[PDB]
Design a binder for this molecule. Structure first.
Ligand SMILES: CCCCCCCCCCCCCCCCCC(=O)OC[C@H](COP(=O)([O-])OCC(O)COP(=O)([O-])OC[C@@H](COC(=O)CCCCCCCCCCCCCCCCC)OC(=O)CCCCCCCCCCCCCCCCC)OC(=O)CCCCCCCCCCCCCCCCC
Ligand SMILES: CCCCCCCCCCCCCCCCCC(=O)OC[C@H](COP(=O)([O-])OCC(O)COP(=O)([O-])OC[C@@H](COC(=O)CCCCCCCCCCCCCCCCC)OC(=O)CCCCCCCCCCCCCCCCC)OC(=O)CCCCCCCCCCCCCCCCC
Ligand SMILES: CCCCCCCCCCCCCCCCCC(=O)OC[C@H](COP(=O)([O-])OCC(O)COP(=O)([O-])OC[C@@H](COC(=O)CCCCCCCCCCCCCCCCC)OC(=O)CCCCCCCCCCCCCCCCC)OC(=O)CCCCCCCCCCCCCCCCC
Ligand SMILES: CCCCCCCCCCCCCCCCCC(=O)O[C@@H](COC(=O)CCCCCCCCCCCCCCC)COP(=O)(O)OCC[N+](C)(C)C
Ligand SMILES: CCCCCCCCCCCCCCCCCC(=O)O[C@@H](COC(=O)CCCCCCCCCCCCCCC)COP(=O)(O)OCC[N+](C)(C)C
Ligand SMILES: CCCCCCCCCCCCCCCCCC(=O)O[C@@H](COC(=O)CCCCCCCCCCCCCCC)COP(=O)(O)OCC[N+](C)(C)C
Ligand SMILES: CCCCCCCCCCCCCCCCCCCC(=O)O[C@H](COC(=O)CCCCCCCCCCCCCC)COP(=O)(O)OCCN
Lengths: 47, 205, 80, 82, 145, 111, 375, 61, 61
């Protein structure tokens, strides 16, 4: 039972989850009309 | 700390300061600044002007309440039976009195708020409390015992609620971002954005 | 994503079989066939849900990188 | 027998007061039509209203809440008279 | 120009007559005359087929449906006349308030063509023609049951 | 101005729906017919079509039997599902021919 | 011609199923399970994205509990209207799709009423119709003025926002829902208080139909909560709960939080299914708890998404109102729980037709842990 | 009166008990279809009017 | 009755007439297999259940 390893592993897991959450929270508008904010996105419109 | 030996939390140095670092390389703002109309109405310099600009709201609310009550009375009256009395003569006092009372109360509130702010010279919670108290005192002029205490309190509390959650709250929590790195903690290794997220375009309705 | 999705799904299938028996007034052990079917279907659905979530996580990572979020290799590692 | 709350008032007087709610009831469509129409026009007008201070808005909401009369209140007290 | 003006002004009198009359049968008759006046307004804007459409769908078919319903549900609505002078002026005031100072635009004249309308309806705008057909099917199925 | 003359027989017309996209891949056929698209459908897609048809036959029979019309439901459901999946496969193959989608196998098979 | 085929397939599918059902109409199969399955397969041809897949899921679940070919056909018509509403690019698409959906509601409501229930059902359908006509006429008149002034039909306008406000049923445009849904069948009220919303939310999110005004959601939240607390009848409690929640959801959706509204609508559907299709006291209790937002159930995740979105926008008044209104609503839900297990012995009809009800209760209980990533 | 009433009761019970299994099943289906056909807005109701005792089409509607 | 085209399954719910279709014949043979496998499993379970095996028989009249 290596307590130091367990503590560091748990802290790392929580920190990775926090980072992933913050990356996930970066969300631009996904509106089809809003072409300006999403100019680089590859979309095809059938209209 | 999660221990019983040392105080929880932490301490931050007052001498040491951290130089501000921009949240993103380029900042695009979808929030429009206050309009010139908003600033004009908010100007409390001249109490009479302030009062006359802000009463339209109280008048509208009084008119809506009076229209509601008048409609309720009108709907019940029977079309099939001929009525000796004139319906408009019965209904017009309802609407007029409701509008007048609402306008008077809102005028008292706006006047007292502006006069206190001018005399004190500072924007403060007390100005709203004293305006509310005066409005509630005018509301409870002839009411039984409990109401003189209750209405000055409820009315005084309402500007406190408006100030706390309309002005202090947003300014207090302006810095928080939600993306990239936590506001206080920029040393931590979190993905750094080139541009802020634009979740919606500036509104226009 | 989740490393316990299969176990969770199997247990939840058990939850379905027992709950359906209990709601109808039967005992938990009744209709044994329902138990196997529920366990298998819930396990598969839980797994499928985990792949779907992972796929949309990666789509999001692609989108944010395109927008301009300077995600590091470690961040690209966070999204399997 | 058990202790019970005392009811203020006489039985027949309270029943008579309760019976003043038994009056011809209008249909709610008539009220709804007007509320829908005026509400639509109100929403269109609201976009053009000047921006008001939060304090003024809250005070207006308070005044409106106080001055609102419940439909039952008018119903009980309505008299077809001058 | 006088004829166009007369039709435009008349449409208001023919709309006021419908609401004011107390007889449901007579209100339909005024509505039929209003529909014909609308056909004549459409003629002044240069539409012939569209004005035909209005008369066919409304005068030809919808009015018949209204008459059928009115005959079946016939009620005694000659109770009393409540058209007091006070009521009429209040109504005319509400109308005037609502219909005042709106943005006005110069009267246009536009020649229409069925060849273009048919082409668009059955080529570029085929999505609308079929959704409308589905709406008619929905109405048929629901009304008949 | 002057009205432009119109030729009644040749009036410009277009389909309702348009795909707004430039062909990323080579265009084997600019305007494929139904038969051309059907002929280019992959073998795996035909296998999917047959699996769907069998599954829908069994499901149709199962649901129909509760109403005493198993055979009729089974055949109708099979036909309906096969038709819908086949139209989807033909749409995909036509898009591949038009160059909108990946056509590596398609170009090789028909030069 | 190939793009058109995708749309054409749906029509061909619907027509052939319609004529097959008409030809094979018999007393022996009043519940046409085969046609229900064909309709479900047909609606898979319109799934293009995740919102379309949610529209399919909800439509299929709704179709399961309708009895007879006729009702299922009108649900397919509702699905087609909903699919077209999401894709509407201008005023004509919006008007056409929503009015077709209104027609399908009028028929579905009319054909699910008994002869003894005709007096109140037809009155509520007529009141719904007349209010819908006011909404549609004001919409089209303003749309005509906008088209004249601008020369183009643009779905980013106040006119559409107010119309979609009517369709959602927020602020003062919620009375049609109360009048109609009180007098109609429980299934019809359930399917038309949830499914239509998804299309409107998709339109608002995709077409940038948002306003700076927060009054309408604040009003809906307070009115709904207070009216839920003061309502004696249980149908009114459930109807006003949707008003309050959709008011809050409207406020969240204006600020761009599309993902949270699409997840909320799905959780709300699953939560409402068991309360509306009441058969077992336990299923109904778990449903009421999920609508209330209790943490062990999936309803907690749905409410959490909205509340989490609210704290991001940092509007104090909304948060305060939300807390107080939620407490008031909680009192109404406690009333519902009290009525079932703490007031009197309860006996209900043995309507043993829990198609997706057991699955929904399971999905509510079990689903919290898988969907914990969202919040 | 008691004796006569129990005689009528005996006759009713004899009638119900004496039916053969095939008839009891058929009657169970009749009852089930009576429950299903209580709704009068079904398409099949428009086609025909059903006999009350046995839910078989009697006449066109 | 008005109609004579009623499905045989509807007219004879207790026992369907002899299978005539290929699909029906296959379903019959599958049912025979399922019945035999089920009786086998029933007997195996009865062994574990012990003395008596929870067996049931028709009662005398
Ligand atoms: C979790 C996180 C969340 C995230 C995502 C969540 C995910 C979301 C979605 C997830 C959804 C989960 C919740 C929904 C659950 C679904 C509902 C459900 O549970 O079932 C409902 C449904 C409800 O049944 P019900 O309550 O009785 O009411 C229906 C009425 O009877 C009405 O009657 P009916 O007229 O409608 O009859 C039709 C139907 C319904 O009929 C019946 O149900 C009657 C009973 C069927 C016969 C008995 C089953 C035989 C074997 C079952 C094994 C049980 C083992 C227990 C004891 C061991 C015995 C040794 O008949 C069928 O069973 C059709 C299926 C065909 C199979 C029939 C059996 C074939 C022979 C056996 C196959 C292979 C034998 C291998 C081993 C055999 C012994 C171990 O259950 C079924 O229909 C059963 C389906 C299949 C039967 C079992 C087949 C299993 C295969 C044998 C085991 C071998 C291992 C399995 C792996 C390999 C497979 C081959
Ligand atoms: C010619 C046609 C006639 C109509 C005239 C105009 C036509 C409409 C045109 C435009 C309509 C749009 C805007 C009007 C208001 C929006 C409401 C609406 O339209 O819904 C349809 C509504 C009918 O809908 P319904 O679903 O059939 O009826 C539901 C009720 O259960 C109805 O059943 P009920 O009446 O029997 O039950 C009433 C119940 C219903 O409950 C409510 O009224 C809930 C409303 C609460 C607040 C609403 C949100 C406030 C936010 C306003 C946003 C703007 C300000 C921004 C910031 C403010 C932050 C809050 O409330 C009560 O029990 C009475 C108390 C009144 C409020 C309760 C709160 C008291 C707090 C004060 C504390 C002081 C007490 C301390 C001492 C206590 C001792 C322990 O139609 C109307 O009522 C329109 C009449 C217009 C009169 C409104 C008066 C002022 C208007 C603005 C002030 C805002 C406050 C709202 C107060 C009352 C509004 C109902
Ligand atoms: C097997 C691989 C699956 C893995 C991934 C799936 C993708 C590949 C699809 C493959 C098919 C598997 C189906 C799984 C997903 C369904 C999606 C889909 O199919 O289309 C997506 C896919 C492309 O769209 P996309 O991937 O979503 O990305 C587009 C953009 O990114 C824009 O779309 P976006 O909305 O996703 O944008 C990203 C979005 C981010 O969005 C997301 O993150 C989505 C999160 C995933 C949640 C999954 C739950 C959704 C519920 C739907 C369940 C699936 C039903 C299946 C229906 C189709 C059946 C095939 O960002 C946002 O903020 C938008 C908000 C999105 C909504 C918010 C999410 C919350 C949903 C509600 C959750 C609340 C919990 C409730 C209960 C939970 C309890 C555990 O379309 C296709 O590939 C073609 C569709 C073909 C379908 C049918 C055609 C085949 C048959 C043809 C003839 C049929 C007739 C014959 C019948 C044959 C059988 C008899
Ligand atoms: C949910 C959707 C609601 C709204 C949907 C609107 C979108 C659908 C609109 C289209 C409705 C159907 C119109 C036909 C659809 C596709 C077009 C088509 O396939 O016709 C072919 C015509 O091509 C053919 O293949 C001719 C044979 C067609 C045979 C049948 C295919 C279409 C069947 C339509 C189904 C209607 C039949 C009855 C309905 C049950 C293409 O036209 P052209 O290319 O201009 O003509 C050929 C000339 N050339 C190729 C040389 C350039
Ligand atoms: C195991 C591989 C082969 C299995 C044989 C089936 C192959 C036949 C081709 C497909 C036909 C449909 C498949 C049967 C599934 C459901 C059929 C069904 O509903 O079963 C019964 C009643 O419903 C049930 O009993 C439910 C059974 C559920 C399914 C149980 C069978 C499990 C395996 C069958 C299908 C597996 C795969 C099929 C091929 C891929 C039908 O009743 P009837 O319409 O009256 O027909 C009976 C004929 N006759 C009375 C006249 C003798
Ligand atoms: C990752 C998953 C999590 C996300 C959730 C959304 C995704 C859904 C994933 C699983 C969906 C499962 C849906 C569960 C539905 C429950 C099954 C059901 O409803 O069966 C009904 C079906 O009822 C019907 O009406 C049958 C008509 C149609 C039958 C099924 C149609 C099949 C069409 C094909 C579907 C395949 C999909 C096509 C391609 C995707 C039977 O109930 P009843 O007999 O009416 O009453 C039950 C009585 N009691 C329980 C008390 C004993
Ligand atoms: C939910 C909050 C509502 C208040 C509830 C209080 C009880 C209601 C009774 C009605 C009385 C009217 C409201 C008065 C509360 C304000 C507190 C008075 C303290 C005070 O007067 O100082 C002011 C600042 O306090 C302030 O105005 C800011 C203090 C914030 C109020 C207290 C916040 C926590 C209270 C919650 C307790 C439990 C919640 C349950 C309700 C002056 O400040 P100044 O700047 O003008 O200096 C003067 C320079 N001229």
């Amino acid at each position: 039972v290596d307590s130091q390893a367990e503590w560091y592993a748990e802290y790392d897991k929580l920190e990775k989850a926090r980072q992933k959450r913050r990356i996930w929270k970066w969300r631009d508008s996904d509106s089809r009309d809003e072409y300006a904010i999403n100019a680089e996105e590859p979309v095809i419109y059938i209209r | 700390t999660f221990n019983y030996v040392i105080p929880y939390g932490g301490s931050s140095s007052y001498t040491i300061n951290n130089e501000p670092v921009k949240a993103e390389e380029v900042t695009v703002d979808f929030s429009k600044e206050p309009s010139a109309s908003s600033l004009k109405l908010a100007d409390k310099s001249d109490w009479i002007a302030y009062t006359f600009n802000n009463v339209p709201l109280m008048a509208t609310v009084g008119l809506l309440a009076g229209a509601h009550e008048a409609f309720l009375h009108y709907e019940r009256t029977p079309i099939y039976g001929k009525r000796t009395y004139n319906i408009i003569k019965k209904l017009a006092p309802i609407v007029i009195n409701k509008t007048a009372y609402a306008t008077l109360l809102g005028a008292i509130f706006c006047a007292t708020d502006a006069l206190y702010e001018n005399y004190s010279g500072k924007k403060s919670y007390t100005s709203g409390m004293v305006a509310g108290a005066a409005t509630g005192a005018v509301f409870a002029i002839g009411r039984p015992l409990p109401q003189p205490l209750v209405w000055p309190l409820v009315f005084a509390a309402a500007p406190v609620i408006a100030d706390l959650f309309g002005e202090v709250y947003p300014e207090s929590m302006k810095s928080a971002r939600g993306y990239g790195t936590p506001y206080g903690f920029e040393n931590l290794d979190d993905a750094v954005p080139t541009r802020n997220p634009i979740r919606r375009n500036p509104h226009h309705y | 994503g989740w490393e316990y999705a299969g176990t969770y799904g199997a247990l939840c299938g058990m939850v379905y079989a027992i709950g359906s028996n209990v709601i109808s007034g039967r005992a938990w052990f009744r209709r044994p066939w329902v138990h196997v079917t529920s366990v298998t279907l819930s396990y598969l659905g839980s797994k499928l849900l985990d792949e779907v979530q992972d796929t949309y996580y990666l789509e999001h990572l692609k989108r944010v990188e395109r927008k301009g979020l300077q995600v590091t290799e470690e961040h690209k590692k966070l999204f399997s | 027998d058990e202790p019970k709350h005392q009811i203020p008032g006489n039985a027949l007087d309270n029943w008579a007061f309760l019976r003043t709610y038994a009056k011809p009831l209008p249909d709610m469509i008539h009220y709804y039509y007007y509320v829908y129409l005026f509400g639509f026009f109100f929403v269109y007008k609201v976009a053009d209203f000047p921006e008001y201070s939060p304090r003024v808005l809250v005070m207006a909401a308070l005044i409106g809440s106080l001055f609102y009369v419940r439909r039952d209140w008018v119903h009980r007290e309505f008299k077809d008279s001058p | 120009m006088l004829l166009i003006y007369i039709m435009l002004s008349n449409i208001v009198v023919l709309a006021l007559s419908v609401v004011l009359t107390s007889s449901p049968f007579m209100a339909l008759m005024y509505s039929i005359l209003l529909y014909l006046n609308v056909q004549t307004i459409l003629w002044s804007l240069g539409y012939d087929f569209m004005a035909l459409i209005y008369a066919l769908v409304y005068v030809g078919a919808l009015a018949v449906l209204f008459l059928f319903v009115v005959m079946m549900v016939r009620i005694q609505v000659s109770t009393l006349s409540t058209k007091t002078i006070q009521s009429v002026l209040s109504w005319l005031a509400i109308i005037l308030i609502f219909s005042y100072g709106d943005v006005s635009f110069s009267f246009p004249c536009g020649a229409e063509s069925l060849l273009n309308f048919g082409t668009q309806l059955y080529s570029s705008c085929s999505d609308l023609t079929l959704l409308n057909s589905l709406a008619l099917t929905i109405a048929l199925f629901g009304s008949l049951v | 101005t002057w009205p432009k003359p119109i030729n009644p027989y040749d009036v410009p017309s277009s389909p309702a729906y348009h795909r707004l996209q430039e062909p990323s891949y080579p265009v084997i056929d600019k305007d494929p017919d139904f038969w051309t698209a059907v002929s280019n459908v992959r073998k795996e897609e035909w296998g999917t079509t047959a699996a769907v048809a069998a599954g829908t036959f069994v499901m149709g029979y199962y649901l129909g039997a509760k109403g005493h019309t198993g055979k009729a439901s089974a055949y109708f459901t099979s036909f309906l599902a096969t038709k819908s999946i086949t139209l989807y496969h033909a749409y995909n193959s036509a898009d591949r021919l038009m160059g909108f989608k990946e056509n590596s196998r398609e170009v090789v098979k028909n030069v | 011609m190939w793009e058109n085929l995708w749309y054409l397939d749906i029509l061909i599918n619907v027509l052939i199923i319609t004529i097959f059902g008409l030809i094979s109409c018999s007393s022996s199969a009043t519940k046409s399970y085969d046609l229900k399955g064909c309709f479900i397969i047909s609606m898979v041809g319109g799934v293009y994205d995740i919102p379309s897949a949610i529209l399919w899921c909800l439509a299929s679940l709704s179709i399961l509990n309708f009895n007879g070919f006729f009702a299922s056909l009108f649900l397919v018509f509702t699905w087609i209207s909903n699919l077209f509403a999401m894709q509407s690019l201008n005023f004509l698409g919006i008007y056409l799709a929503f009015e077709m959906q209104s027609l399908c509601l009028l028929v579905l409501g009319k054909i699910t009423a008994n002869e003894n229930q005709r007096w109140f059902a037809y009155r509520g359908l007529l009141k719904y119709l007349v209010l819908s006509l006011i909404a549609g006429s004001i919409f089209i008149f303003h749309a005509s003025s906008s088209y004249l002034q601008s020369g183009v039909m643009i779905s980013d306008s106040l006119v559409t926002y107010v119309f979609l406000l009517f369709k959602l049923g927020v602020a003062p445009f919620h009375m049609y829902t109360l009048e109609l849904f009180s007098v109609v069948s429980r299934h019809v009220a359930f399917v038309f208080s949830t499914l239509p919303k998804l299309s409107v939310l998709y339109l608002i999110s995709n077409s940038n139909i948002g306003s700076e005004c927060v009054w309408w959601g604040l009003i809906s939240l307070w009115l709904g909560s207070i009216s839920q607390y003061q309502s004696v009848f249980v149908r009114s409690i459930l109807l006003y709960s949707s008003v309050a929640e959709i008011g809050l959801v409207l406020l969240v959706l204006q600020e761009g939080f599309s993902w949270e509204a699409f997840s909320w609508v799905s959780i709300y559907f699953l939560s409402l299914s068991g309360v509306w299709h009441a058969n077992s006291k336990f299923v109904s209790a778990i449903s009421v708890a999920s609508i209330a937002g209790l943490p062990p159930f999936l309803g907690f995740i749905g409410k959490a998404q909205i509340l989490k979105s609210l704290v991001s926008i940092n509007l104090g008044i909304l948060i305060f109102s939300s807390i107080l209104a939620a407490t008031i609503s909680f009192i109404g839900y406690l009333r519902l729980i009290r009525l079932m297990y703490l007031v009197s012995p309860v006996k209900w009809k043995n309507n043993k037709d829990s198609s997706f009800i057991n699955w929904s209760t399971w999905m509510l209980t079990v689903g919290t842990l898988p969907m914990v990533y969202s919040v | 009166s008691s004796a006569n009433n129990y005689d009528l009761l005996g006759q009713q019970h004899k009638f119900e008990n004496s039916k053969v299994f095939e008839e009891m099943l058929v009657e169970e289906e009749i009852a089930k279809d009576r429950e299903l056909l209580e709704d009068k807005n079904l398409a099949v109701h428009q086609l025909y009017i059903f006999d009350p005792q046995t839910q078989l089409a009697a006449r066109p509607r | 009755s008005l109609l004579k085209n009623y499905p045989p399954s509807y007219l004879y719910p207790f026992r369907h007439p002899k299978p005539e279709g290929v699909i029906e014949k296959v379903l019959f043979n599958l049912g025979s297999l399922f019945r035999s496998a089920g009786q086998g499993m029933d007997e195996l379970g009865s062994l574990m259940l012990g003395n008596g095996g929870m067996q049931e028989s028709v009662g005398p009249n």
